[PDB]
Write an enzyme that holds these catalytic residues in place. Structure first.
Site, mmCIF file in Angstrom:
data_model
loop_
_atom_site.group_PDB
_atom_site.id
_atom_site.type_symbol
_atom_site.label_atom_id
_atom_site.label_comp_id
_atom_site.label_asym_id
_atom_site.label_seq_id
_atom_site.Cartn_x
_atom_site.Cartn_y
_atom_site.Cartn_z
ATOM 1 N N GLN C 11 36.477 0.228 12.753
ATOM 2 C CA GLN C 11 35.928 1.482 12.275
ATOM 3 C C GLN C 11 35.020 2.147 13.303
ATOM 4 O O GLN C 11 35.117 3.353 13.552
ATOM 5 C CB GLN C 11 35.200 1.309 10.939
ATOM 6 C CG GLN C 11 34.946 2.716 10.391
ATOM 7 C CD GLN C 11 33.944 2.795 9.282
ATOM 8 O OE1 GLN C 11 33.861 1.840 8.534
ATOM 9 N NE2 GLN C 11 33.233 3.902 9.188
ATOM 10 N N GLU C 62 41.988 -1.546 7.733
ATOM 11 C CA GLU C 62 41.683 -0.854 6.504
ATOM 12 C C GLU C 62 42.066 0.616 6.660
ATOM 13 O O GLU C 62 41.835 1.203 7.694
ATOM 14 C CB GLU C 62 40.251 -1.044 5.950
ATOM 15 C CG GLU C 62 39.208 -0.507 6.817
ATOM 16 C CD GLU C 62 38.876 0.925 6.526
ATOM 17 O OE1 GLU C 62 39.223 1.445 5.419
ATOM 18 O OE2 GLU C 62 38.222 1.518 7.383
ATOM 19 N N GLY C 135 34.619 -7.171 11.385
ATOM 20 C CA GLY C 135 35.719 -8.101 11.175
ATOM 21 C C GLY C 135 36.893 -7.824 12.103
ATOM 22 O O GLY C 135 37.278 -8.630 12.943
ATOM 23 N N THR C 136 37.479 -6.646 11.959
ATOM 24 C CA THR C 136 38.666 -6.266 12.687
ATOM 25 C C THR C 136 38.315 -5.866 14.108
ATOM 26 O O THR C 136 39.169 -5.968 14.981
ATOM 27 C CB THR C 136 39.498 -5.216 11.964
ATOM 28 O OG1 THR C 136 40.660 -4.896 12.716
ATOM 29 C CG2 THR C 136 38.743 -3.925 11.818
ATOM 30 N N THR C 170 22.886 -4.357 9.168
ATOM 31 C CA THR C 170 23.888 -3.804 8.241
ATOM 32 C C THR C 170 25.040 -4.765 7.970
ATOM 33 O O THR C 170 26.163 -4.351 7.645
ATOM 34 C CB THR C 170 24.372 -2.417 8.680
ATOM 35 O OG1 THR C 170 25.231 -2.568 9.802
ATOM 36 C CG2 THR C 170 23.233 -1.492 9.086
ATOM 37 N N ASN C 197 22.830 -0.037 18.719
ATOM 38 C CA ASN C 197 22.570 1.035 17.778
ATOM 39 C C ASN C 197 21.122 1.489 17.771
ATOM 40 O O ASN C 197 20.895 2.696 17.777
ATOM 41 C CB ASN C 197 23.044 0.659 16.386
ATOM 42 C CG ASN C 197 24.555 0.858 16.271
ATOM 43 O OD1 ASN C 197 25.179 1.788 16.826
ATOM 44 N ND2 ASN C 197 25.181 -0.065 15.609
ATOM 45 N N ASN C 219 27.625 9.016 18.366
ATOM 46 C CA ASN C 219 28.921 8.981 18.994
ATOM 47 C C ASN C 219 29.089 10.084 20.036
ATOM 48 O O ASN C 219 29.887 9.930 20.962
ATOM 49 C CB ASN C 219 30.022 9.009 17.955
ATOM 50 C CG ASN C 219 30.004 7.826 17.038
ATOM 51 O OD1 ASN C 219 29.220 6.912 17.168
ATOM 52 N ND2 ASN C 219 30.891 7.836 16.086
ATOM 53 N N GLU C 245 36.824 0.005 41.343
ATOM 54 C CA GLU C 245 35.695 -0.171 42.238
ATOM 55 C C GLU C 245 34.402 -0.418 41.467
ATOM 56 O O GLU C 245 33.459 -0.839 42.111
ATOM 57 C CB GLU C 245 35.557 1.033 43.195
ATOM 58 C CG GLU C 245 34.950 0.709 44.543
ATOM 59 C CD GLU C 245 35.911 0.036 45.510
ATOM 60 O OE1 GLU C 245 37.151 0.091 45.296
ATOM 61 O OE2 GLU C 245 35.421 -0.544 46.473
#
Lengths: 426, 428, 428
Positions: C11, C62, C135-136, C170, C197, C219, C245
């Protein structure tokens, strides 16, 4: 073109046939006066399958009404859509075979059969070239089982190469009208196995189960039961009367269903069938429709199909639908319900798409399946027959009018072997 | 001058032919009446004042499929005796279509074919469209090919068979129908292309993202393949080929003339927006095994011969570069005794789009017709399924009682057994 | 010709990729359709009539985050098969993403990557975006890396890991996912950059003065770092730097490839008005410990190697003047065995500002990637937290029951212990 001559025999056959002409005439848009209304070309392009022009614009059914008692045929004439038939096509009897197969076949039916043979030849030969016959009758009564099957024997001898489809209601399993059911049924089956090309079985107790549990109708009369049988009877001849993406006539269904010539007894189902309450809540799509079609609760014979194997089955779909879902769902049932299909016939299911659905529904299907679960009924009525025959109960109402002892033993032998042959492929 | 005669037999033949002739009319710009407001002369005849009638015959025993053409939009496109109808169906019986109700229609069919073939001698050949699993498509297909072989002996006869799928059939008697047809297609057709229904189903699922296609969307895809096949005969190109040089370039041995198909690109408006359609990439997608149109994975076979028909804005230098990349790629296998495994062909005119159809406008496209040894699987699986059915003589009494002799099943089976050994011996 | 492949897993990878691809489209001037109204070739392909499609794959198990990209504004920028979705989430389990559900989607991922990498040779490398704490992002991220390592051996593999924060989590089971990922990204990644974060949180609170930013404001800042990293591939510069390089200049020994980030200036529209943005002062702010993008104070570390990417109207004489001041400053210290600890790059094209975003249009910027021995503390904090969790065997039944065996916890712990001793031995 291709033409079906309709014959309705007995009280049950007349009342089931009366509603058949109600449902076909409404589907083709014929007024009870006989006029056309509805300004659509597809309705009228294939109408000679069931109707005849009368040079006054009106269409008359190619139907022959036959009974030995005058009462119930008067009721059909007096009702709505009763003025549709030609009055000459009504052939009465006066005295009536009182629930006697012997008097229906040998004595009382014999002086009428020459007259019904005249009228069926007049309608059959009068066109170009005939496709088949359809006969609706009962195998519990006297005139529907006795003289109905005599007509089957006589018209097979006249027209040997034409197909002959018969909609017969069997005796009910548990509770029975007309106490001599197994005598009438067993005597009718042994020469209906040798004279009828495809035979479609209906039970009243399966129809009652449908009207209780699925349709949720509180008071189902014979009007509503006959309407259900008429819906399935119209679905089997969808392809003759309307165009389609994958066309399939009656003989196409015959070659695809019956592997060996002795076994041609079919189970009939109809979908969709929802209550008035649940009409607006249900998904109409191809995957749901095939699930209701393959249910014991929807079959019009009260014999559980899960106790046997489907030898071959066929599904005549009607409506504007996609042919991949017509294909893939028939693959899906063979993969999921692997145990309920026979192994030495690959791809047991046959599909057919007719493009014109019945009125009010977007999509419908009729199911005709050749199952080896029909041996449960043949065993059951054989045991009821053998119980009464050992003690010679009610026999001299058959023996007295010229049917001797040996034909009863032949009837039992010719039907017990039919049970054994279904077990052979089980 | 030079023309080709199309024969459509059976329901599948007619409805595929309906899609084929709708594409041909739009490509040459003739209206459904048949008048445009000599490149088209290979498919249409001149009939007086600018008017063009197609060189096709429609043959079915059922009236229910042909009557809708007689009453449809294309009533006056076709000459009324090119649409020939019987009275009763063959009813999924090879024996019915071949012996009993066969002779009443074939005499009328040969009269129409003879009148259509004697206009301008020097005609290229015959295209036959049929379903192998059906009754009249298999039965009348044999009978008409026998009569055409005796009359027009030295002629090219191309057959487009809608072969039954491995899993989905929509009939039960199709192991009987398919083995009996292939006996009569072996001695009587010149080039046969196998098309499968569930192959075109899965092509339409992945490439067009249509989850519920009807028979009409299968038939449009078939029509695009045939249009690209005969595009060289109709239009000018950089390197054109006619139908006579297919046999020279694709059929190495007399019995091995079973061919696959692939068409690329088959892309919707969602995908044509985002792809470049370079000649290198459309030929890579043509050889991709899931884009084959017969449901026969060519990974476990060897390509005997391959024929590529490029159509559109295609320069011949990109063809040579693109075929070189295919040869160097190791995932395909060619047979050792065919080094020059390719025939290239270039046409100028881009593929035409039917309005309101499901394809998008493409600037260049490829149609591939390949001969491979992977076809051993598609005949061996049908060989198995006939063995199961005939093990205890199911559905036999409909054939044998109705006019053919018991033993023609056995003779057809040994012919198919001979074909299996032939494919095995060539691949060594 | 020269391109890079972007991989977004998890995600966090997708949503960071969403901001990355919005910036890349706007700087090269392509619309959300993909058509502009050879500098773009490193990130975008050519697809027919002037349309450009990104060279990226979006992977999550997901469906919710990838469906919302597929239905948004950027539906037809991405290829429909470049957005790969599973059915069920990995659900904060490394074991689920690696062993149980992960293997069903990796086959589809490798097919897309192979088709995207075969377009031209001289593929520069792979940019992978993932969350270590997920997880993913951790499980499937590792699994993709074994298959990429076996196929594309010699190609460079850069990773941008959204590392778990010192205080903010989190997630509760993320110490387990982090140690297991770090073991398996030692041997499968060439260059790893840690993005934290809370480092971006406090950078946005002091520099941009936003009291309540969200993940979309994080982001944008990540997107500016990646754009400044790959600016030399896309545009001309005075002294350009390639992606091969970076690993030559920043990785002294194979196991040390964990680097920080810093970007300067990040100033809002109200503060840019008052700043003279000299090359000397933007490089002073880049090395300031409060402007770092990992929340890892380098004052208790030694800088092993440093890479400075200047972007905009920067002259090479002001770079030399600015970096000399940094070397002479005594609060920043270098390791003794690396006397020349700088790599400088200058690019011409100034950073592009997204409209409605919170950065201001600036004439020059610096992106700094530095390798230091301060990374010992960021592994030490999880080494404390992992030992607390594992001491009485908490949350292990979720991993063990799902298909991994007990003991990969032990192997990952000792590998991290080996990494801590390696960083300590280098800094002596």
């Amino acid at each position: 073109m291709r033409e079906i001559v309709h014959v309705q025999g007995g009280q049950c056959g007349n009342q089931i046939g009366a509603k058949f002409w109600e449902v076909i005439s409404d589907e083709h848009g014929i007024d009870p006066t006989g006029t056309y209304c509805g300004d659509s070309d597809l309705q009228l392009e294939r109408i000679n399958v069931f109707y005849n022009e009368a040079t006054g614009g009106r269409f008359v059914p190619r139907a022959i009404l036959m009974d030995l008692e005058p009462g119930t045929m008067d009721s059909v004439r007096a009702g709505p859509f009763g003025q549709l038939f030609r009055p000459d096509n009504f052939v009465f009897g006066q005295t009536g075979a009182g629930n006697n197969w012997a008097k229906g076949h040998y004595t009382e039916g014999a002086e009428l059969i020459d007259s019904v043979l005249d009228v069926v030849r007049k309608e059959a030969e009068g066109c170009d070239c005939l496709q088949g016959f359809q006969i609706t009758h009962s195998l519990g009564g006297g005139t529907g089982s006795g003289m109905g099957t005599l007509l089957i024997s006589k018209v097979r001898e006249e027209y040997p190469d034409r197909i002959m489809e018969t909609f017969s209601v069997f005796p009910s399993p548990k509770v029975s009208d007309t106490v001599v059911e197994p005598y009438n049924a067993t005597l009718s089956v042994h020469q209906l196995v040798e004279n009828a090309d495809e035979v479609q079985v209906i039970d009243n107790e399966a129809l009652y189960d449908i009207c209780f549990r699925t349709l949720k109708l509180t008071t189902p009369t014979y009007g509503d039961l006959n309407h259900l049988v008429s819906a399935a009877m119209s679905g089997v001849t969808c392809c003759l009367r309307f165009p389609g993406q994958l066309n399939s006539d009656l003989r196409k269904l015959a070659v695809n269903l019956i592997p060996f010539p002795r076994l041609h007894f079919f189970l009939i189902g109809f979908a969709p069938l929802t209550s008035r309450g649940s009409q607006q809540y249900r998904a109409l799509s191809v995957p749901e429709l095939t699930q209701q079609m393959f249910d014991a609760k929807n079959m019009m014979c009260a014999s559980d199909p899960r106790h046997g194997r489907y030898l071959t089955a066929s599904a005549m779909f009607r409506g504007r639908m996609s042919t991949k879902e017509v294909d893939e769902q028939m693959l899906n049932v063979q993969n999921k319900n692997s145990s309920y299909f026979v192994e030495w016939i690959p791809n047991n299911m046959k599909s057919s798409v007719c493009d014109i659905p019945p009125k009010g529904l977007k999509m419908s299907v009729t199911f005709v399946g050749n199952s080896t679960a029909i041996q449960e009924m043949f065993k059951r009525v054989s045991d009821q027959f053998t119980a009464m025959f050992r003690r010679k109960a009610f026999l001299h109402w058959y023996t007295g009018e010229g049917m001797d002892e040996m034909e009863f033993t032949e009837a039992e032998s010719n039907m017990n072997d039919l049970v054994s042959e279904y077990q052979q492929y089980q | 001058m030079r023309e080709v005669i199309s024969i459509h037999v059976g329901q599948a033949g007619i409805q595929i032919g309906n899609a084929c002739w709708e594409l041909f009319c739009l490509e040459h710009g003739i209206q459904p009446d048949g008048q445009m407001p000599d490149a088209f002369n290979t498919f249409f005849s001149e009939t007086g004042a600018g008017k063009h009638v197609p060189r096709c015959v429609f043959l079915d025993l059922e009236p229910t499929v042909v009557d809708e053409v007689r009453t449809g939009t294309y009533r006056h496109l076709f000459h009324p005796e090119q649409l020939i109808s019987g009275k009763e169906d063959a009813a999924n019986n090879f024996a019915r279509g071949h012996y009993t109700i066969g002779k009443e229609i074939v005499d009328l069919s040969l009269d129409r074919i003879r009148k259509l073939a004697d206009n301008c001698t020097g005609l290229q050949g015959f295209l036959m469209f049929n379903a192998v699993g059906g009754g009249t498509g298999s039965g009348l297909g044999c009978l008409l090919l026998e009569r055409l072989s005796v009359d027009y002996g030295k002629k090219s006869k191309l057959n487009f068979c809608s072969w039954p799928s491995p899993q989905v059939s929509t009939a039960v008697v199709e192991p009987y129908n398919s083995v009996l047809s292939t006996h009569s297609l072996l001695e009587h057709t010149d080039v046969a292309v196998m098309l499968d229904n569930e192959a075109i189903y899965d092509i339409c699922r992945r490439n067009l993202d249509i989850e519920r296609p009807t028979y009409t969307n299968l038939n449009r895809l078939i029509a695009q393949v045939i249009s690209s096949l005969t595009a060289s005969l109709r239009f000018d190109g950089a390197l054109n080929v006619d139908v006579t040089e297919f046999q020279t370039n694709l059929v190495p041995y007399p019995r091995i003339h079973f061919m696959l198909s692939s068409y690329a690109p088959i892309i919707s408006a969602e995908k044509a927006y985002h792809e470049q359609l370079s000649v290198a990439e459309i030929t890579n997608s043509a050889f991709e095994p899931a884009s084959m149109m017969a449901k026969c994975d060519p990974r476990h076979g060897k390509y005997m011969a391959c024929c590529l028909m490029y159509r559109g804005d295609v320069v011949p230098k990109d063809v040579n570069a693109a075929v070189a990349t295919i040869k160097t790629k190791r995932t395909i296998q060619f047979v050792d005794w065919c080094p020059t495994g390719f025939k290239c062909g270039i046409n100028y005119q881009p593929p035409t789009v039917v309005p309101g159809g499901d394809l998008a406008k493409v600037m260049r496209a490829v149609c591939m017709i390949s001969n491979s040894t992977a076809i051993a699987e598609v005949f061996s699986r049908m060989d198995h399924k006939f063995d199961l059915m005939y093990a205890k003589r199911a559905f036999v009494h409909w054939y044998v009682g109705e006019g053919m002799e018991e033993g023609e099943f056995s003779e057809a089976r040994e012919d198919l057994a001979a074909l299996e050994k032939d494919y095995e011996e060539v691949g060594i």
